[PDB]
């Protein structure tokens, strides 16, 4: 699943689920909501909640 995620001025290159977790972590720290992280990454809010507890 090679895929590029654009949030504001940053683009995250995603190649695996470990990369999605990393982006999730960055976006949370930048103050994005769980709803907003889920839409940005193309996953569910449940997956994002799992991601942010790591």
């Amino acid at each position: 699943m090679k895929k590029e995620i654009q949030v504001q001025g940053v683009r995250y290159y995603v190649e695996s689920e470990d990369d999605l977790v990393s982006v999730a972590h960055e976006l949370a720290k930048m103050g994005y909501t769980v709803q907003q992280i889920a839409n940005a990454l193309g996953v569910s809010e449940r997956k994002v909640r799992r991601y942010l507890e790591s």
Side-chain angles (χ1 to χ4, degrees):
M1 59 140 100
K2 193 158 53 169
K3 155 183 171 184
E4 189 194 308
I5 304 193
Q6 159 138 76
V7 168
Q8 292 280 31
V10 193
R11 305 182 221 173
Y12 308 86
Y13 292 67
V14 159
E15 226 163 331
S16 73
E17 194 174 9
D18 281 309
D19 297 345
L20 283 176
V21 168
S22 280
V23 173
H25 288 165
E26 269 217 21
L27 296 172
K29 287 183 174 86
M30 290 185 65
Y32 285 92
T33 63
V34 173
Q35 163 69 120
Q36 286 163 1
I37 292 167
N39 277 89
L41 303 187
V43 300
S44 67
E45 295 190 48
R46 290 170 69 75
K47 279 281 186 188
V48 178
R49 294 203 306 278
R50 290 168 152 176
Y51 292 169
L52 301 184
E53 72 178 62
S54 301

mmCIF file of all heavy atoms in Angstrom:
data_model
loop_
_atom_site.group_PDB
_atom_site.id
_atom_site.type_symbol
_atom_site.label_atom_id
_atom_site.label_comp_id
_atom_site.label_asym_id
_atom_site.label_seq_id
_atom_site.Cartn_x
_atom_site.Cartn_y
_atom_site.Cartn_z
ATOM 1 N N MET A 1 0.835 -1.236 0.000
ATOM 2 C CA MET A 1 0.000 0.000 0.000
ATOM 3 C C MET A 1 0.859 1.272 0.000
ATOM 4 O O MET A 1 0.840 2.031 0.973
ATOM 5 C CB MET A 1 -0.953 0.018 1.216
ATOM 6 C CG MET A 1 -0.266 -0.051 2.613
ATOM 7 S SD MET A 1 -1.002 1.011 3.910
ATOM 8 C CE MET A 1 -1.980 -0.208 4.811
ATOM 9 N N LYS A 2 1.603 1.519 -1.076
ATOM 10 C CA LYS A 2 2.381 2.767 -1.170
ATOM 11 C C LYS A 2 1.439 3.962 -1.417
ATOM 12 O O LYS A 2 0.616 3.939 -2.329
ATOM 13 C CB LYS A 2 3.468 2.669 -2.245
ATOM 14 C CG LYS A 2 4.515 3.795 -2.176
ATOM 15 C CD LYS A 2 5.845 3.408 -2.851
ATOM 16 C CE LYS A 2 5.664 2.898 -4.289
ATOM 17 N NZ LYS A 2 6.960 2.767 -5.026
ATOM 18 N N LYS A 3 1.575 5.003 -0.600
ATOM 19 C CA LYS A 3 0.522 6.015 -0.446
ATOM 20 C C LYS A 3 1.072 7.273 0.249
ATOM 21 O O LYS A 3 1.849 7.171 1.201
ATOM 22 C CB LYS A 3 -0.628 5.364 0.344
ATOM 23 C CG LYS A 3 -1.571 6.245 1.151
ATOM 24 C CD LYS A 3 -2.580 5.336 1.900
ATOM 25 C CE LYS A 3 -3.446 6.089 2.922
ATOM 26 N NZ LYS A 3 -4.360 5.203 3.703
ATOM 27 N N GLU A 4 0.680 8.453 -0.229
ATOM 28 C CA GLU A 4 1.198 9.725 0.305
ATOM 29 C C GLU A 4 0.098 10.599 0.931
ATOM 30 O O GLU A 4 -0.859 10.964 0.258
ATOM 31 C CB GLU A 4 1.901 10.498 -0.810
ATOM 32 C CG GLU A 4 2.671 11.715 -0.334
ATOM 33 C CD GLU A 4 3.062 12.646 -1.466
ATOM 34 O OE1 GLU A 4 3.659 12.185 -2.470
ATOM 35 O OE2 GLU A 4 2.766 13.850 -1.342
ATOM 36 N N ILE A 5 0.263 10.961 2.201
ATOM 37 C CA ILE A 5 -0.766 11.699 2.953
ATOM 38 C C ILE A 5 -0.408 13.183 3.134
ATOM 39 O O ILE A 5 0.640 13.516 3.683
ATOM 40 C CB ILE A 5 -0.986 11.053 4.347
ATOM 41 C CG1 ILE A 5 -1.337 9.564 4.166
ATOM 42 C CG2 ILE A 5 -2.056 11.808 5.120
ATOM 43 C CD1 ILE A 5 -1.875 8.879 5.376
ATOM 44 N N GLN A 6 -1.281 14.072 2.674
ATOM 45 C CA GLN A 6 -1.010 15.518 2.729
ATOM 46 C C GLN A 6 -1.849 16.205 3.799
ATOM 47 O O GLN A 6 -3.084 16.247 3.713
ATOM 48 C CB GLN A 6 -1.223 16.186 1.357
ATOM 49 C CG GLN A 6 -1.464 17.702 1.439
ATOM 50 C CD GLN A 6 -0.730 18.499 0.386
ATOM 51 O OE1 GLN A 6 -1.124 18.532 -0.789
ATOM 52 N NE2 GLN A 6 0.339 19.174 0.807
ATOM 53 N N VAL A 7 -1.151 16.739 4.802
ATOM 54 C CA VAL A 7 -1.743 17.585 5.845
ATOM 55 C C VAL A 7 -0.988 18.907 5.885
ATOM 56 O O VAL A 7 0.194 18.928 6.229
ATOM 57 C CB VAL A 7 -1.657 16.916 7.233
ATOM 58 C CG1 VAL A 7 -2.010 17.918 8.348
ATOM 59 C CG2 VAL A 7 -2.571 15.701 7.289
ATOM 60 N N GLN A 8 -1.670 20.000 5.545
ATOM 61 C CA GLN A 8 -1.058 21.336 5.519
ATOM 62 C C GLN A 8 0.217 21.290 4.675
ATOM 63 O O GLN A 8 0.157 20.832 3.537
ATOM 64 C CB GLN A 8 -0.810 21.869 6.943
ATOM 65 C CG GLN A 8 -2.091 22.187 7.733
ATOM 66 C CD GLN A 8 -2.725 23.546 7.368
ATOM 67 O OE1 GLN A 8 -2.632 24.017 6.228
ATOM 68 N NE2 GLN A 8 -3.373 24.172 8.345
ATOM 69 N N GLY A 9 1.357 21.713 5.223
ATOM 70 C CA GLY A 9 2.615 21.751 4.465
ATOM 71 C C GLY A 9 3.439 20.467 4.461
ATOM 72 O O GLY A 9 4.477 20.398 3.801
ATOM 73 N N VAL A 10 2.973 19.452 5.183
ATOM 74 C CA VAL A 10 3.714 18.211 5.364
ATOM 75 C C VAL A 10 3.075 17.102 4.553
ATOM 76 O O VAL A 10 1.850 17.004 4.492
ATOM 77 C CB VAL A 10 3.720 17.769 6.842
ATOM 78 C CG1 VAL A 10 4.750 16.672 7.061
ATOM 79 C CG2 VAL A 10 4.001 18.950 7.761
ATOM 80 N N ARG A 11 3.909 16.269 3.930
ATOM 81 C CA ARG A 11 3.446 15.056 3.266
ATOM 82 C C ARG A 11 4.148 13.839 3.818
ATOM 83 O O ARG A 11 5.373 13.768 3.801
ATOM 84 C CB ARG A 11 3.704 15.138 1.787
ATOM 85 C CG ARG A 11 3.086 16.353 1.195
ATOM 86 C CD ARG A 11 3.317 16.403 -0.273
ATOM 87 N NE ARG A 11 3.635 17.749 -0.694
ATOM 88 C CZ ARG A 11 4.010 18.063 -1.923
ATOM 89 N NH1 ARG A 11 4.102 17.117 -2.864
ATOM 90 N NH2 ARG A 11 4.279 19.332 -2.209
ATOM 91 N N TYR A 12 3.367 12.882 4.302
ATOM 92 C CA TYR A 12 3.911 11.674 4.907
ATOM 93 C C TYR A 12 3.833 10.520 3.910
ATOM 94 O O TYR A 12 2.763 10.236 3.377
ATOM 95 C CB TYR A 12 3.133 11.331 6.182
ATOM 96 C CG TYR A 12 3.019 12.477 7.168
ATOM 97 C CD1 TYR A 12 1.993 13.422 7.062
ATOM 98 C CD2 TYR A 12 3.934 12.614 8.206
ATOM 99 C CE1 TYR A 12 1.891 14.479 7.975
ATOM 100 C CE2 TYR A 12 3.839 13.657 9.121
ATOM 101 C CZ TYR A 12 2.820 14.588 9.002
ATOM 102 O OH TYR A 12 2.751 15.622 9.905
ATOM 103 N N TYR A 13 4.970 9.878 3.651
ATOM 104 C CA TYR A 13 5.034 8.729 2.747
ATOM 105 C C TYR A 13 4.775 7.457 3.565
ATOM 106 O O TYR A 13 5.577 7.096 4.435
ATOM 107 C CB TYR A 13 6.402 8.635 2.058
ATOM 108 C CG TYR A 13 6.715 9.742 1.053
ATOM 109 C CD1 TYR A 13 6.899 11.069 1.460
ATOM 110 C CD2 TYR A 13 6.872 9.455 -0.305
ATOM 111 C CE1 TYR A 13 7.199 12.073 0.538
ATOM 112 C CE2 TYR A 13 7.174 10.457 -1.231
ATOM 113 C CZ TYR A 13 7.333 11.761 -0.800
ATOM 114 O OH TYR A 13 7.633 12.746 -1.718
ATOM 115 N N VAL A 14 3.655 6.792 3.277
ATOM 116 C CA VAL A 14 3.197 5.609 4.017
ATOM 117 C C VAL A 14 3.422 4.363 3.177
ATOM 118 O O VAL A 14 3.027 4.313 2.018
ATOM 119 C CB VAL A 14 1.690 5.726 4.342
ATOM 120 C CG1 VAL A 14 1.074 4.375 4.624
ATOM 121 C CG2 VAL A 14 1.483 6.673 5.503
ATOM 122 N N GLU A 15 4.052 3.360 3.770
ATOM 123 C CA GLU A 15 4.403 2.124 3.065
ATOM 124 C C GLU A 15 3.915 0.863 3.810
ATOM 125 O O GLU A 15 4.015 -0.246 3.292
ATOM 126 C CB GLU A 15 5.929 2.087 2.918
ATOM 127 C CG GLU A 15 6.445 1.701 1.551
ATOM 128 C CD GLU A 15 7.907 2.079 1.347
ATOM 129 O OE1 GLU A 15 8.369 3.072 1.955
ATOM 130 O OE2 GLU A 15 8.595 1.388 0.560
ATOM 131 N N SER A 16 3.387 1.048 5.021
ATOM 132 C CA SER A 16 3.065 -0.044 5.943
ATOM 133 C C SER A 16 2.209 0.513 7.078
ATOM 134 O O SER A 16 2.053 1.734 7.206
ATOM 135 C CB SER A 16 4.342 -0.640 6.542
ATOM 136 O OG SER A 16 4.921 0.249 7.490
ATOM 137 N N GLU A 17 1.668 -0.373 7.910
ATOM 138 C CA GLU A 17 0.827 0.055 9.029
ATOM 139 C C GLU A 17 1.652 0.747 10.124
ATOM 140 O O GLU A 17 1.150 1.651 10.785
ATOM 141 C CB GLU A 17 0.009 -1.114 9.605
ATOM 142 C CG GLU A 17 -1.125 -0.651 10.527
ATOM 143 C CD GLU A 17 -2.042 -1.765 11.014
ATOM 144 O OE1 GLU A 17 -1.741 -2.960 10.799
ATOM 145 O OE2 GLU A 17 -3.079 -1.433 11.625
ATOM 146 N N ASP A 18 2.907 0.337 10.310
ATOM 147 C CA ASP A 18 3.797 1.005 11.277
ATOM 148 C C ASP A 18 3.970 2.499 10.939
ATOM 149 O O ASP A 18 4.115 3.335 11.837
ATOM 150 C CB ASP A 18 5.168 0.305 11.353
ATOM 151 C CG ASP A 18 5.140 -0.974 12.198
ATOM 152 O OD1 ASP A 18 4.651 -0.936 13.348
ATOM 153 O OD2 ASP A 18 5.620 -2.023 11.711
ATOM 154 N N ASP A 19 3.937 2.820 9.647
ATOM 155 C CA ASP A 19 4.019 4.199 9.188
ATOM 156 C C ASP A 19 2.734 4.957 9.513
ATOM 157 O O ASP A 19 2.778 6.148 9.836
ATOM 158 C CB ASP A 19 4.286 4.264 7.676
ATOM 159 C CG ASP A 19 5.640 3.651 7.270
ATOM 160 O OD1 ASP A 19 6.510 3.423 8.151
ATOM 161 O OD2 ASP A 19 5.832 3.394 6.059
ATOM 162 N N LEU A 20 1.592 4.280 9.413
ATOM 163 C CA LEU A 20 0.311 4.916 9.727
ATOM 164 C C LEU A 20 0.295 5.303 11.189
ATOM 165 O O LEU A 20 -0.139 6.406 11.538
ATOM 166 C CB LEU A 20 -0.891 4.001 9.437
ATOM 167 C CG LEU A 20 -1.368 3.796 7.996
ATOM 168 C CD1 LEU A 20 -2.510 2.779 7.980
ATOM 169 C CD2 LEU A 20 -1.806 5.111 7.350
ATOM 170 N N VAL A 21 0.760 4.398 12.047
ATOM 171 C CA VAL A 21 0.841 4.689 13.482
ATOM 172 C C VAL A 21 1.665 5.956 13.710
ATOM 173 O O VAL A 21 1.214 6.873 14.394
ATOM 174 C CB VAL A 21 1.439 3.511 14.272
ATOM 175 C CG1 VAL A 21 1.797 3.942 15.696
ATOM 176 C CG2 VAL A 21 0.457 2.336 14.280
ATOM 177 N N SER A 22 2.847 6.016 13.095
ATOM 178 C CA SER A 22 3.732 7.168 13.222
ATOM 179 C C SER A 22 3.068 8.477 12.807
ATOM 180 O O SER A 22 3.198 9.479 13.508
ATOM 181 C CB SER A 22 5.003 6.960 12.418
ATOM 182 O OG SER A 22 5.914 6.141 13.123
ATOM 183 N N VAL A 23 2.355 8.469 11.683
ATOM 184 C CA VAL A 23 1.640 9.666 11.229
ATOM 185 C C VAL A 23 0.522 10.028 12.213
ATOM 186 O O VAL A 23 0.338 11.197 12.557
ATOM 187 C CB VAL A 23 1.053 9.480 9.824
ATOM 188 C CG1 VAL A 23 0.168 10.673 9.439
ATOM 189 C CG2 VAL A 23 2.176 9.314 8.811
ATOM 190 N N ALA A 24 -0.206 9.017 12.676
ATOM 191 C CA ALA A 24 -1.259 9.210 13.654
ATOM 192 C C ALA A 24 -0.695 9.943 14.851
ATOM 193 O O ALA A 24 -1.272 10.936 15.295
ATOM 194 C CB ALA A 24 -1.847 7.869 14.080
ATOM 195 N N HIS A 25 0.437 9.456 15.362
ATOM 196 C CA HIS A 25 1.112 10.082 16.521
ATOM 197 C C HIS A 25 1.464 11.542 16.266
ATOM 198 O O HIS A 25 1.270 12.377 17.151
ATOM 199 C CB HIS A 25 2.398 9.338 16.923
ATOM 200 C CG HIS A 25 2.166 8.014 17.586
ATOM 201 N ND1 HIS A 25 3.170 7.079 17.745
ATOM 202 C CD2 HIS A 25 1.050 7.461 18.122
ATOM 203 C CE1 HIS A 25 2.683 6.015 18.360
ATOM 204 N NE2 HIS A 25 1.400 6.221 18.599
ATOM 205 N N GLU A 26 1.992 11.845 15.077
ATOM 206 C CA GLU A 26 2.349 13.231 14.732
ATOM 207 C C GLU A 26 1.124 14.129 14.666
ATOM 208 O O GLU A 26 1.149 15.263 15.136
ATOM 209 C CB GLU A 26 3.115 13.333 13.402
ATOM 210 C CG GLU A 26 4.642 13.269 13.541
ATOM 211 C CD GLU A 26 5.401 14.181 12.567
ATOM 212 O OE1 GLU A 26 4.831 15.174 12.030
ATOM 213 O OE2 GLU A 26 6.599 13.896 12.351
ATOM 214 N N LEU A 27 0.057 13.635 14.068
ATOM 215 C CA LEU A 27 -1.113 14.476 13.861
ATOM 216 C C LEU A 27 -1.796 14.777 15.200
ATOM 217 O O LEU A 27 -2.290 15.888 15.423
ATOM 218 C CB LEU A 27 -2.068 13.831 12.853
ATOM 219 C CG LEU A 27 -1.499 13.678 11.439
ATOM 220 C CD1 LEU A 27 -2.446 12.848 10.565
ATOM 221 C CD2 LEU A 27 -1.220 15.040 10.785
ATOM 222 N N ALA A 28 -1.803 13.798 16.094
ATOM 223 C CA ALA A 28 -2.357 13.990 17.435
ATOM 224 C C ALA A 28 -1.603 15.089 18.163
ATOM 225 O O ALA A 28 -2.206 15.998 18.727
ATOM 226 C CB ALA A 28 -2.294 12.680 18.237
ATOM 227 N N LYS A 29 -0.280 14.995 18.152
ATOM 228 C CA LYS A 29 0.578 16.009 18.774
ATOM 229 C C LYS A 29 0.327 17.400 18.174
ATOM 230 O O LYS A 29 0.452 18.400 18.869
ATOM 231 C CB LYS A 29 2.066 15.635 18.647
ATOM 232 C CG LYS A 29 2.540 14.483 19.561
ATOM 233 C CD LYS A 29 4.042 14.244 19.410
ATOM 234 C CE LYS A 29 4.591 13.219 20.400
ATOM 235 N NZ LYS A 29 4.461 11.811 19.908
ATOM 236 N N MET A 30 -0.028 17.462 16.891
ATOM 237 C CA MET A 30 -0.366 18.710 16.195
ATOM 238 C C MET A 30 -1.800 19.148 16.491
ATOM 239 O O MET A 30 -2.268 20.147 15.960
ATOM 240 C CB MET A 30 -0.220 18.536 14.676
ATOM 241 C CG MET A 30 1.205 18.396 14.163
ATOM 242 S SD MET A 30 1.237 18.347 12.356
ATOM 243 C CE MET A 30 0.648 19.993 11.968
ATOM 244 N N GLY A 31 -2.513 18.373 17.302
ATOM 245 C CA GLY A 31 -3.834 18.767 17.782
ATOM 246 C C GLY A 31 -5.005 18.408 16.903
ATOM 247 O O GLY A 31 -6.066 19.025 17.009
ATOM 248 N N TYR A 32 -4.826 17.414 16.040
ATOM 249 C CA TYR A 32 -5.915 16.944 15.195
ATOM 250 C C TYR A 32 -6.781 15.992 16.023
ATOM 251 O O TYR A 32 -6.275 15.290 16.880
ATOM 252 C CB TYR A 32 -5.369 16.272 13.924
ATOM 253 C CG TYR A 32 -4.842 17.274 12.922
ATOM 254 C CD1 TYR A 32 -3.508 17.652 12.927
ATOM 255 C CD2 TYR A 32 -5.682 17.878 12.004
ATOM 256 C CE1 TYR A 32 -3.016 18.598 12.028
ATOM 257 C CE2 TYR A 32 -5.200 18.827 11.096
ATOM 258 C CZ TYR A 32 -3.866 19.177 11.112
ATOM 259 O OH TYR A 32 -3.366 20.107 10.222
ATOM 260 N N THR A 33 -8.087 15.994 15.786
ATOM 261 C CA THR A 33 -8.992 15.107 16.498
ATOM 262 C C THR A 33 -8.891 13.699 15.929
ATOM 263 O O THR A 33 -8.319 13.502 14.865
ATOM 264 C CB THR A 33 -10.428 15.585 16.355
ATOM 265 O OG1 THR A 33 -10.807 15.547 14.970
ATOM 266 C CG2 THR A 33 -10.574 17.010 16.900
ATOM 267 N N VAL A 34 -9.452 12.728 16.640
ATOM 268 C CA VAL A 34 -9.495 11.336 16.189
ATOM 269 C C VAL A 34 -10.298 11.210 14.887
ATOM 270 O O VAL A 34 -9.929 10.461 13.978
ATOM 271 C CB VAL A 34 -10.120 10.437 17.270
ATOM 272 C CG1 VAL A 34 -10.339 9.027 16.753
ATOM 273 C CG2 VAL A 34 -9.231 10.411 18.507
ATOM 274 N N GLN A 35 -11.404 11.944 14.809
ATOM 275 C CA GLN A 35 -12.216 11.992 13.588
ATOM 276 C C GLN A 35 -11.342 12.443 12.413
ATOM 277 O O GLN A 35 -11.355 11.827 11.345
ATOM 278 C CB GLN A 35 -13.444 12.903 13.801
ATOM 279 C CG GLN A 35 -14.183 13.388 12.536
ATOM 280 C CD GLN A 35 -14.923 12.279 11.782
ATOM 281 O OE1 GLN A 35 -16.153 12.342 11.619
ATOM 282 N NE2 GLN A 35 -14.175 11.268 11.296
ATOM 283 N N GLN A 36 -10.558 13.493 12.641
ATOM 284 C CA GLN A 36 -9.732 14.095 11.605
ATOM 285 C C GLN A 36 -8.535 13.223 11.225
ATOM 286 O O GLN A 36 -8.107 13.235 10.076
ATOM 287 C CB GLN A 36 -9.254 15.489 12.046
ATOM 288 C CG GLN A 36 -10.340 16.578 12.002
ATOM 289 C CD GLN A 36 -9.997 17.825 12.813
ATOM 290 O OE1 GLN A 36 -8.937 17.921 13.418
ATOM 291 N NE2 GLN A 36 -10.902 18.782 12.823
ATOM 292 N N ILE A 37 -7.981 12.482 12.180
ATOM 293 C CA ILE A 37 -6.870 11.564 11.887
ATOM 294 C C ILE A 37 -7.360 10.381 11.047
ATOM 295 O O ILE A 37 -6.677 9.946 10.128
ATOM 296 C CB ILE A 37 -6.160 11.068 13.182
ATOM 297 C CG1 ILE A 37 -5.422 12.229 13.844
ATOM 298 C CG2 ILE A 37 -5.151 9.978 12.857
ATOM 299 C CD1 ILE A 37 -4.952 11.947 15.241
ATOM 300 N N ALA A 38 -8.563 9.901 11.349
ATOM 301 C CA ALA A 38 -9.157 8.777 10.647
ATOM 302 C C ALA A 38 -9.422 9.098 9.176
ATOM 303 O O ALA A 38 -9.154 8.276 8.299
ATOM 304 C CB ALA A 38 -10.443 8.357 11.339
ATOM 305 N N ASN A 39 -9.955 10.283 8.900
ATOM 306 C CA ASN A 39 -10.179 10.694 7.518
ATOM 307 C C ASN A 39 -8.878 10.920 6.769
ATOM 308 O O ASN A 39 -8.785 10.589 5.590
ATOM 309 C CB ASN A 39 -11.063 11.944 7.438
ATOM 310 C CG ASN A 39 -12.539 11.607 7.521
ATOM 311 O OD1 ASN A 39 -13.104 11.549 8.615
ATOM 312 N ND2 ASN A 39 -13.165 11.342 6.366
ATOM 313 N N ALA A 40 -7.881 11.478 7.448
ATOM 314 C CA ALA A 40 -6.597 11.769 6.814
ATOM 315 C C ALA A 40 -5.857 10.498 6.375
ATOM 316 O O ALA A 40 -5.189 10.500 5.340
ATOM 317 C CB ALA A 40 -5.722 12.594 7.743
ATOM 318 N N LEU A 41 -6.002 9.427 7.159
ATOM 319 C CA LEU A 41 -5.272 8.168 6.958
ATOM 320 C C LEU A 41 -6.095 7.079 6.248
ATOM 321 O O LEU A 41 -5.542 6.076 5.780
ATOM 322 C CB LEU A 41 -4.788 7.614 8.310
ATOM 323 C CG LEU A 41 -3.891 8.485 9.201
ATOM 324 C CD1 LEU A 41 -3.401 7.689 10.391
ATOM 325 C CD2 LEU A 41 -2.720 9.032 8.431
ATOM 326 N N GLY A 42 -7.411 7.257 6.184
ATOM 327 C CA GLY A 42 -8.276 6.290 5.515
ATOM 328 C C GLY A 42 -8.540 5.047 6.341
ATOM 329 O O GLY A 42 -8.759 3.960 5.797
ATOM 330 N N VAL A 43 -8.525 5.218 7.659
ATOM 331 C CA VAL A 43 -8.881 4.159 8.599
ATOM 332 C C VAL A 43 -10.069 4.603 9.457
ATOM 333 O O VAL A 43 -10.587 5.712 9.295
ATOM 334 C CB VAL A 43 -7.685 3.770 9.502
ATOM 335 C CG1 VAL A 43 -6.527 3.278 8.653
ATOM 336 C CG2 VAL A 43 -7.261 4.939 10.384
ATOM 337 N N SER A 44 -10.509 3.720 10.348
ATOM 338 C CA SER A 44 -11.611 4.019 11.257
ATOM 339 C C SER A 44 -11.106 4.731 12.506
ATOM 340 O O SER A 44 -9.912 4.740 12.794
ATOM 341 C CB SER A 44 -12.348 2.739 11.651
ATOM 342 O OG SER A 44 -11.525 1.899 12.436
ATOM 343 N N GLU A 45 -12.036 5.329 13.240
ATOM 344 C CA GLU A 45 -11.718 5.992 14.496
ATOM 345 C C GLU A 45 -11.220 4.989 15.543
ATOM 346 O O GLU A 45 -10.389 5.330 16.378
ATOM 347 C CB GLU A 45 -12.929 6.780 15.012
ATOM 348 C CG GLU A 45 -13.330 7.941 14.093
ATOM 349 C CD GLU A 45 -14.361 8.881 14.704
ATOM 350 O OE1 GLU A 45 -14.181 9.307 15.865
ATOM 351 O OE2 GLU A 45 -15.347 9.215 14.007
ATOM 352 N N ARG A 46 -11.702 3.752 15.473
ATOM 353 C CA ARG A 46 -11.242 2.691 16.367
ATOM 354 C C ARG A 46 -9.766 2.360 16.161
ATOM 355 O O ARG A 46 -9.019 2.251 17.133
ATOM 356 C CB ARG A 46 -12.102 1.441 16.199
ATOM 357 C CG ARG A 46 -13.496 1.642 16.729
ATOM 358 C CD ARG A 46 -14.432 0.502 16.362
ATOM 359 N NE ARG A 46 -14.109 -0.752 17.042
ATOM 360 C CZ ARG A 46 -14.354 -1.011 18.327
ATOM 361 N NH1 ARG A 46 -14.906 -0.095 19.122
ATOM 362 N NH2 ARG A 46 -14.032 -2.200 18.828
ATOM 363 N N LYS A 47 -9.354 2.201 14.905
ATOM 364 C CA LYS A 47 -7.942 1.977 14.575
ATOM 365 C C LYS A 47 -7.063 3.117 15.103
ATOM 366 O O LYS A 47 -6.016 2.879 15.707
ATOM 367 C CB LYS A 47 -7.755 1.846 13.061
ATOM 368 C CG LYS A 47 -8.072 0.475 12.496
ATOM 369 C CD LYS A 47 -6.928 -0.502 12.729
ATOM 370 C CE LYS A 47 -7.187 -1.829 12.044
ATOM 371 N NZ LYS A 47 -6.170 -2.857 12.406
ATOM 372 N N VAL A 48 -7.504 4.351 14.874
ATOM 373 C CA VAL A 48 -6.779 5.530 15.348
ATOM 374 C C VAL A 48 -6.662 5.546 16.877
ATOM 375 O O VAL A 48 -5.609 5.876 17.400
ATOM 376 C CB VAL A 48 -7.430 6.854 14.876
ATOM 377 C CG1 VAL A 48 -6.663 8.052 15.436
ATOM 378 C CG2 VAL A 48 -7.503 6.919 13.345
ATOM 379 N N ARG A 49 -7.725 5.184 17.592
ATOM 380 C CA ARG A 49 -7.665 5.117 19.053
ATOM 381 C C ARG A 49 -6.615 4.093 19.492
ATOM 382 O O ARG A 49 -5.815 4.382 20.377
ATOM 383 C CB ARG A 49 -9.045 4.822 19.669
ATOM 384 C CG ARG A 49 -10.072 5.949 19.455
ATOM 385 C CD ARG A 49 -11.213 5.964 20.467
ATOM 386 N NE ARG A 49 -11.917 4.681 20.578
ATOM 387 C CZ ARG A 49 -12.883 4.252 19.760
ATOM 388 N NH1 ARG A 49 -13.287 4.991 18.730
ATOM 389 N NH2 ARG A 49 -13.446 3.064 19.969
ATOM 390 N N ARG A 50 -6.604 2.920 18.857
ATOM 391 C CA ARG A 50 -5.555 1.913 19.085
ATOM 392 C C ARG A 50 -4.171 2.485 18.829
ATOM 393 O O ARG A 50 -3.233 2.227 19.580
ATOM 394 C CB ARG A 50 -5.713 0.720 18.144
ATOM 395 C CG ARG A 50 -6.887 -0.178 18.401
ATOM 396 C CD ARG A 50 -7.086 -1.130 17.206
ATOM 397 N NE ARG A 50 -7.716 -2.405 17.561
ATOM 398 C CZ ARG A 50 -8.055 -3.346 16.679
ATOM 399 N NH1 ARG A 50 -7.835 -3.158 15.376
ATOM 400 N NH2 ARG A 50 -8.621 -4.482 17.096
ATOM 401 N N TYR A 51 -4.039 3.230 17.740
ATOM 402 C CA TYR A 51 -2.745 3.778 17.355
ATOM 403 C C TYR A 51 -2.214 4.740 18.402
ATOM 404 O O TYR A 51 -1.037 4.698 18.740
ATOM 405 C CB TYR A 51 -2.827 4.499 16.007
ATOM 406 C CG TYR A 51 -3.075 3.625 14.790
ATOM 407 C CD1 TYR A 51 -3.393 4.207 13.565
ATOM 408 C CD2 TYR A 51 -2.952 2.234 14.843
ATOM 409 C CE1 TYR A 51 -3.605 3.441 12.437
ATOM 410 C CE2 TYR A 51 -3.166 1.456 13.718
ATOM 411 C CZ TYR A 51 -3.492 2.064 12.518
ATOM 412 O OH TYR A 51 -3.700 1.302 11.395
ATOM 413 N N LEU A 52 -3.090 5.588 18.930
ATOM 414 C CA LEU A 52 -2.686 6.642 19.857
ATOM 415 C C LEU A 52 -2.386 6.135 21.260
ATOM 416 O O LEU A 52 -1.820 6.870 22.063
ATOM 417 C CB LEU A 52 -3.746 7.750 19.918
ATOM 418 C CG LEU A 52 -4.058 8.445 18.592
ATOM 419 C CD1 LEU A 52 -5.034 9.567 18.819
ATOM 420 C CD2 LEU A 52 -2.796 8.958 17.935
ATOM 421 N N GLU A 53 -2.743 4.886 21.555
ATOM 422 C CA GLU A 53 -2.398 4.287 22.851
ATOM 423 C C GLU A 53 -1.039 3.559 22.822
ATOM 424 O O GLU A 53 -0.737 2.784 23.731
ATOM 425 C CB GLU A 53 -3.524 3.357 23.347
ATOM 426 C CG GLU A 53 -3.684 2.020 22.614
ATOM 427 C CD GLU A 53 -4.789 1.150 23.205
ATOM 428 O OE1 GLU A 53 -5.960 1.583 23.187
ATOM 429 O OE2 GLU A 53 -4.490 0.037 23.695
ATOM 430 N N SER A 54 -0.226 3.825 21.791
ATOM 431 C CA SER A 54 1.085 3.169 21.610
ATOM 432 C C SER A 54 2.244 4.160 21.790
ATOM 433 O O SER A 54 2.114 5.357 21.500
ATOM 434 C CB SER A 54 1.178 2.523 20.215
ATOM 435 O OG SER A 54 0.164 1.548 20.005
#
